[PDB]
Design a protein around this ligand. Structure first.
Ligand SMILES: [Mg+2]
Ligand SMILES: [Zn+2]
Lengths: 129, 71, 221, 102, 134, 25, 82, 82
RNA sequence: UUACGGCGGU
RNA sequence: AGAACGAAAGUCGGAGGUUCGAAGACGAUCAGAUACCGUCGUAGUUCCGACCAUAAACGAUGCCGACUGGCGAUGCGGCGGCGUUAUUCCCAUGACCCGCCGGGCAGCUUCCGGGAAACCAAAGUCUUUGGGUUCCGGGGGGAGUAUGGUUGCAAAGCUGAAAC
């Protein structure tokens, strides 16, 4: 009864960074949560991470930098269009200078700016700032 | 908690419409027995005839007689 | 102290082992599990002496970096540690508080017991906790010599030696005062320091003068 | 407000403990709420000890004990003063008062 | 009905602090010293201060009371600083350890550098005092 | 008045209005 | 703080905790800034210079200021490296 | 305990955990070779065995099943294979 | 052992 | 939607009937006692069968999942250890001693955090607001009333307003 493995991954990272730690252990791996973490690693909010591969579903250890505020999840994956995308931004971003809602398209798991650079809508997946 | 998943808009909408029957300002406006029962019948004014000059006593903090009628 | 001059110098290990200084309480604290070696068969947690030496040097480097010498306030409340805390500050030039700590020395500016130090070193984290919880609010770093029982709430350079027995307390005050003068230009690292660690130990009760004069029929007369 | 963390009663994983009855008013209490007191009183009333050993058939006879386990309702335990009123932070210890036998 | 108030006590602790060499265990002489060295505004609290002054004369000549006067205080500089022994409490060169704490100094490469004859722990595990009130 | 003894004097009272309605059918 | 015209529009830059990367505020009055003074290599005496480390009040009160400055002094070449 | 390197655990912190919950999960069990006194037959019984183990040559009883870890009946040879 | 009430507004 | 179980009192029938004892009679106590208190005692408390389906039915806290401090223990399994003790004059298994592992009942501490605070390691991970889902609340009365339906032999249960 883990209805969203993406939601449980990000909640664990959010508890451990406000606790002050350096590493986490994300007990189920997924190819949506490694393509969620490399969206926030390339913007520089986390560090190296290591997929501890097993023969069942793997585990992930993430190096936390301490440069993170909250890395929440939007749990019903509401479909967002490009007209709809700006009003999602002022709901769940702190400012217009920083922070990213990250959403999955047909062309990949992206940003809000990466999805409007390429002019494509999709399904909202999470946010981090 | 509430039911959040996308496709539950039948349950969220049918639960909101029968929980609005639990405050005053919806239920006295949308039932009908609160407009059949006021004497103006959904009006701001009505005419009537005078039957009895009556005086009612004011509340305990106050002590006076308020001059009323029996329209 | 990652150097070679600052290494252990085996001679003084014999002073640790002859004073206690590696024998701790049967319960241990969770923030001191890195300093410990193992529990004995008698329940006693014995302590890695290399780890209490590395913190001893690290506490010494903090006090050397304080420019005004009479500005590292040095406190002790329990009786085992009051002779040591005074002639700590006599030798190294610090400022002592002994006996009872009056609450607000640090946080109240009006009264005449108002000191404003930049560093403070503590004999015991729990039995002398009242300056710890106060020195956190004139943003002051704190040093303690802590045994395995003791919490590490506001301490920074917790020395994991011993703070129960009278021998071990005065020795670690002597060992810290020796090495903090030696990182100054006062001991030239070669000859051992002419002050003896017995000078910092806790005082005997009233039979002091009775016993020494029974072996002094050849000094006064 | 919730006055005490337990509700006066030492039941945690139960739904019903046995009802027992108080001693000096015969009121029915739960067994865990009841204020027990186990009296190991000597049956001889110690001022009357040198009047039964000088009138016994021995010189060394161990006197029998009277083992009466009282238990009270909280109503009669406060009235007969076997539990005293306590302040709102000195309630929180489960140690009994010390012995004071001599 | 005897118990002395704050202004009598605080004015007599300041006398014995500051004129201790000029005092003694007589009442009628200490009455006259405090008469001549302190401004007392009447006769009744004069000798009532002098009473508590003589009460502290016998009190501090038996020991160190709250006594910041010089001679009782300089005499404990010959306790904190004096009695440095001629042979140490540390340097006995014959001290005991246990087989696990010598393994602690074995990785410190001090195993044969030291003398350190060992004692063994008496093998019981009888620590952790028994539980419950009796 | 207590609320378990308010419940009694309405349970005693709505068996008395239930019975007069039974009379005047 | 770097506007689009390229200039600093900011009263000050605030310190951040060397243990936990979080900003010490203007009234986080449990936050220390300590000096650890290294020594010269041949003789082991204080040579004038030192190292500054900040510990915020959140991570100090939490109780691991010791494991902090044992881990960023090990980082500095201090301690055993063992 | 903030910067505990939980990707390289020590082998004695890895051993004193559950058979799940580890950095990589692994059984506590093993296969053991049991030689009876007086037979030329190596038997390859599982450690947490569950059955009344009978042999072929000397078909006597060889271990007793219990709660956790199967108990060899009479004093017989034992080695932990692989 | 018994110990029941205290007009309204301020 | 639909069902199964459901303290006590209660209802119907058959056994039983010691104690206790609503109703009731009597003695006290009081201004009055239809109460407390005392003597007595019916129905009932006990068993069998059928019902009734509610309680401060309470941790006044739905269930499932993860994550976030420490500590002392305890209950049950499992593993590993010095030694003490049992037929044991050896053993295997027990009793204790020292640990670890999972599950449970809780406790003690803490600026984890939250809260209107009491307090809570959950009531935390919430304007930095979204893990799944069920039930339900919307000022105080009227009122769990009136009325319709439905269940029950009955008592009543369930659903359940409004004028004011
Ligand atoms: Mg009642
Ligand atoms: Zn009672």
């Amino acid at each position: 009864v883990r209805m969203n493995v993406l939601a449980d991954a990000l909640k664990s990272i959010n508890n451990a960074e406000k606790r002050g730690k350096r590493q986490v252990l994300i007990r189920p791996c997924s190819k949506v949560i490694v393509r969620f973490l490399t969206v926030m690693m390339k913007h520089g909010y986390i560090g190296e991470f290591e997929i501890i591969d097993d023969h069942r579903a793997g585990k992930i250890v993430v190096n936390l930098t301490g440069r993170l505020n909250k890395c929440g999840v939007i749990s019903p994956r509401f479909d967002v269009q490009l007209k709809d995308l700006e009003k999602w931004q002022n709901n769940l971003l702190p400012s217009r200078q920083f922070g990213f809602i990250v959403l999955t398209t047909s062309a990949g798991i992206m940003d809000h700016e990466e999805a409007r650079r390429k002019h494509t809508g999709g399904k909202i997946l999470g946010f981090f700032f | 908690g509430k039911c959040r998943g996308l496709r539950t808009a039948r349950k969220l909408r049918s639960h909101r419409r029968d929980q609005k029957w639990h405050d005053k300002q919806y239920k006295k406006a949308h039932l009908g027995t609160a407009l059949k029962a006021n004497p103006f019948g959904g009006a701001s004014h009505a005419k009537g005839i005078v039957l009895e000059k009556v005086g009612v006593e004011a509340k305990q903090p106050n002590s006076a007689i308020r001059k009323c009628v029996r329209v | 102290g990652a150097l070679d001059v600052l290494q252990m110098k085996e001679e003084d290990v014999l002073k640790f082992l002859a004073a206690g200084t590696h024998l701790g309480g049967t319960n241990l604290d969770f923030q001191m599990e890195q300093y410990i070696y193992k529990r004995k068969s008698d329940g006693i947690y014995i302590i890695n002496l290399k780890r209490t030496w590395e913190k001893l040097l690290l506490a010494a480097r903090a006090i050397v970096a304080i420019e005004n010498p009479a500005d590292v306030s040095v406190i002790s409340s329990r009786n085992t540690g009051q002779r040591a805390v005074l002639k700590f500050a006599a030798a190294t030039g610090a400022t002592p508080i002994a006996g009872r700590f009056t609450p607000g020395t640090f946080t109240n500016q009006i009264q005449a017991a108002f000191r404003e130090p930049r560093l403070l070193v503590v004999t015991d984290p729990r039995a002398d906790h009242q300056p710890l919880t106060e020195a956190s609010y004139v943003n002051l770093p704190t040093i303690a010599l802590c045994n395995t029982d003791s919490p590490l709430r506001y301490v920074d350079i917790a020395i994991p030696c011993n703070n129960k027995g009278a021998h071990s307390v005065g020795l670690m005050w002597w060992m810290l005062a020796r090495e903090v003068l030696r990182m100054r230009g006062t001991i030239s690292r070669e000859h051992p320091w002419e002050v003896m660690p017995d000078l910092y130990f806790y005082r005997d009760p009233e039979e002091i003068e009775k016993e020494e004069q029974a072996a002094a029929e050849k000094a006064v007369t | 407000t919730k006055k005490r963390r337990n509700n006066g009663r030492a039941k945690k994983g139960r739904g019903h403990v046995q009802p027992i009855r108080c001693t000096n008013c015969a009121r029915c209490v739960p067994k865990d709420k009841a204020i027990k007191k186990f009296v190991i009183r000597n049956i001889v009333e110690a001022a009357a000890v040198r009047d039964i050993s000088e009138a016994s058939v021995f010189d060394a006879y161990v006197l029998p004990k009277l083992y009466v386990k009282l238990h009270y309702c909280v109503s009669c335990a406060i009235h007969s003063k076997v539990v005293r009123n306590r302040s709102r932070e000195a309630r929180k210890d489960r140690t009994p008062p010390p012995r004071f036998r001599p | 009905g005897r118990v002395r108030t704050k202004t009598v006590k605080k004015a007599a602790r300041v006398i014995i602090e500051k004129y201790y060499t000029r005092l003694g265990n007589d009442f009628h002489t200490n009455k006259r010293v405090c008469e001549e060295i302190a401004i007392i505004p009447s006769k009744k609290l004069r000798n009532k201060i002098a009473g508590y002054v003589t009460h502290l004369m016998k009190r501090i000549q038996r020991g160190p009371v709250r006594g910041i006067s010089i001679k009782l205080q300089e005499e404990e500089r010959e306790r904190r600083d004096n009695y440095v022994p001629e042979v140490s409490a540390l340097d006995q060169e014959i001290i005991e350890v246990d087989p696990d704490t010598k393994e602690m100094l074995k990785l410190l490469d001090f195993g044969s550098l030291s003398n350190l004859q060992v004692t063994q722990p008496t093998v019981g595990m009888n620590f952790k005092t028994p539980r419950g009130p009796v | 008045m207590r609320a378990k003894w308010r419940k009694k004097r309405m349970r005693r009272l709505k068996r008395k209005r239930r019975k007069m309605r039974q009379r005047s059918k | 703080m770097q506007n689009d015209a390229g200039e600093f529009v900011d009263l000050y830059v605030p310190r951040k905790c060397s243990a936990s990367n979080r900003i010490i505020g203007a009234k986080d009055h449990a936050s220390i800034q300590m000096n650890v003074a290294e020594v010269d290599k041949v003789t082991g005496r204080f040579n004038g210079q030192f190292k500054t480390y900040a510990i915020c009040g959140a991570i100090r009160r939490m109780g691991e200021s010791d494991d902090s400055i044992l881990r960023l002094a090990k980082a500095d070449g201090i301690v055993s490296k063992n | 305990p903030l910067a505990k390197d939980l990707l390289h655990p020590s082998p004695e912190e890895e051993k004193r955990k559950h058979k799940k919950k580890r950095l990589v999960q692994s059984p506590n069990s093993y296969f053991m070779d049991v030689k009876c006194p007086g037979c030329y037959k190596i038997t390859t019984v599982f450690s947490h065995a569950q059955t009344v183990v009978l042999c072929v040559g000397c078909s006597t009883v060889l271990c007793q099943p219990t709660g956790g870890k199967a108990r060899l009946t009479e004093g017989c040879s034992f080695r932990r294979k692989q």
